[PDB]
């Protein structure tokens, strides 16, 4: 099971797998989801540090954005796990810089499926994460005003 030593071990295997054969959906998806499950294990540990969860949150965001472009039609899980980190750990300076480049990198016609999730958190009380949502919704209005 996922332990304090098993988690570092499987990251070496997943990271080496991604570089051997890039442009593979099952490689980036597996590596990205493990980091998301790694921070959850550490999140439950300290509730019963900023620099202990940032080492796993930053690679997780990058991994999911790469996997989104490799699916193109069946990426509902990938585009929904990004919002989980965006709405929780997205107020760090090191996370926003990764999010701003990811949004522009991927096609605009991907956030249409997650419109109800975006509208549900327009009123986030954190200005650093709040303004990024408004600008994202404005871009969707320019291209697809009939859906928003």
């Amino acid at each position: 099971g996922i332990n304090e030593s098993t988690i570092p071990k499987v990251l070496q295997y997943y990271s080496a797998a991604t570089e051997h054969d890039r442009s593979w959906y099952k490689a980036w998806h597996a590596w990205a989801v493990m980091n998301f499950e790694a921070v959850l294990h550490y999140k439950h540990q300290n509730q019963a540090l900023s620099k202990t969860l940032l080492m796993y949150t930053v690679p997780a965001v990058q991994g999911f954005f790469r996997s989104i472009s490799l699916s193109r039609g069946n990426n509902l899980q990938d585009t929904l796990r990004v919002l989980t980190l965006w709405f929780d750990y997205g107020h760090w300076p090191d996370v926003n810089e990764a999010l701003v480049e990811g949004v522009k990198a991927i096609q605009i016609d991907t956030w249409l499926q997650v419109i109800p999730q975006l509208i549900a958190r327009i009123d986030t009380p954190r200005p650093l994460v709040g303004r990024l949502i408004h600008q994202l919704l404005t871009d969707i209005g320019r291209y697809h005003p009939q859906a928003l």
Binding site: N74, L76, Q113, P116
Partner: protein
Amino acid sequence: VFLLKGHEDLRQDERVMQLFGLVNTLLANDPTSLRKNLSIQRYAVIPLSTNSGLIGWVPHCDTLHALIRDYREKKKILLNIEHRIMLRMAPDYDHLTLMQKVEVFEHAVNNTAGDDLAKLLWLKSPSSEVWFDRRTNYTRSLAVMSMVGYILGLGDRH
């Protein structure tokens, strides 16, 4: 044709429609499930406020309660024969204990043969070839919603 609803919160119904869309995609790319043609029928849900909404109208569909009711009234059969028997045997049925309600419930289902739905479908089939095709779809469409509904925890399926 839509169905303008009032004093109902349709935001929850919009979220479960998205969930059923994911399940349809999962069953679409499964070689053993795609061949059996397994899918979940959906209808458009467009909420307008915190207590209002707009649900699309699905044609050629009628509720199960009204379907059985028409069959029984045509055959000169009371709509609540099963309920009348239980009250006749024990007027205070609602206040009985768990073991006593089983005796009343089991007696009612033995004196009445439940085949109204089985004969209802056949009488509405123009030919036997159509009848078999419709019955196959019914069997495997009720099974999908049973397991999907179990995971979602659906209740009040009157």
